Amino acid sequence: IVGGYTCGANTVPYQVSLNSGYHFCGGSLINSQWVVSAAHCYKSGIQVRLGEDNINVVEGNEQFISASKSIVHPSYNSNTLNNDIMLIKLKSAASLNSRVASISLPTSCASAGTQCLISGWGNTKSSGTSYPDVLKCLKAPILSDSSCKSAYPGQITSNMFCAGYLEGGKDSCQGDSGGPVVCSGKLQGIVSWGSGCAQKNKPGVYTKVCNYVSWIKQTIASN
Ligand SMILES: CC(C)COc1cccc(-c2nc3cc(C(N)=[NH2+])ccc3[nH]2)c1[O-]
Ligand SMILES: [Ca+2]
Numbered sequence: 677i678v679g680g681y682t683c684g685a686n687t688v689p690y691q692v693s694l695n696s697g698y699h700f701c702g703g704s705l706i707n708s709q710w711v712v713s714a715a716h717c718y719k720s721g722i723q724v725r726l727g728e729d730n731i732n733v734v735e736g737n738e739q740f741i742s743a744s745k746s747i748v749h750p751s752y753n754s755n756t757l758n759n760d761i762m763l764i765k766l767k768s769a770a771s772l773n774s775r776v777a778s779i780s781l782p783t784s785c786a787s788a789g790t791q792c793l794i795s796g797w798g799n800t801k802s803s804g805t806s807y808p809d810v811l812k813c814l815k816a817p818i819l820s821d822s823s824c825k826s827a828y829p830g831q832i833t834s835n836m837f838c839a840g841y842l843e844g845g846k847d848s849c850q851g852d853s854g855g856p857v858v859c860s861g862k863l864q865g866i867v868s869w870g871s872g873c874a875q876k877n878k879p880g881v882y883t884k885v886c887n888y889v890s891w892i893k894q895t896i897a898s899n
């Protein structure tokens with residue numbers, strides 16, 4: 677997260693770290709056995725780390741669970757990142773409490789101007805790599821579709837939305853991918869891509885979760 681602040685230990689209880697010997701992507705807990713992340717964060721050998729604050733120190737509250745299966749969206753396109761969503765089923769359910777809790781899926785899509793919270797352990801510099809030990813937070817508004825398409829002409833599908841600041845300085849970045857964009861307490865986006873990090877006129881692009889609620893529900897129900 678570039679230009680964000682320290683969240684505070686466990687103030688984002690649905691945030692998870694996908695780990696394969698190091699943190700590589702974020703994700704969101706939606707129920708005690710399922711996590712939603714981005715399809716491009718897929719790989720085998722994933723360990724889901726819940727209740728984390730400092731990812732390099734066991735401080736207590738952590739629950740490390742292996743993934744039983746990862747379900748990448750069947751229409752995911754690695755070239756355009758269209759349908760960039762994935763569900764991971766956990767080997768055992770997580771114990772939910774105030775430090776580990778799930779987030780709700782939306783009932784409607786959010787409008788431009790809606791303020792949301794983005795979090796993650798991704799890079800904090802737009803030029804060079806500086807990865808933090810604790811969770812960073814950023815409050816960013818959803819941008820209008822016209823500003824998003826003007827910024828990325830020909831690359832935004834109806835399953836993507838832009839959120840951020842056109843002046844630069846605040847944005848999600850590498851290491852944040854797969855993580856949550858929460859607005860009015862609902863999971864509205866998944867960190868997907870952007871051009872560099874916090875560059876002027878190049879806001880972040882997020883998977884539009886409201887277009888996938890029936891898919892998530894039908895897929896969790898049949899697995
Ligand atoms: C399969 C993963 C291990 C590789 O992940 C990645 C490798 C290189 C870059 C990214 C990445 N850049 C990103 C930029 C942004 C942004 N809003 N500007 C957001 C997420 C990003 N994720 C990223 O998620
Ligand atoms: Ca830790």
Ligand SMILES: [Cl-]
Nearest residue numbers: 825829830831
């Ligand atoms: Cl266009």
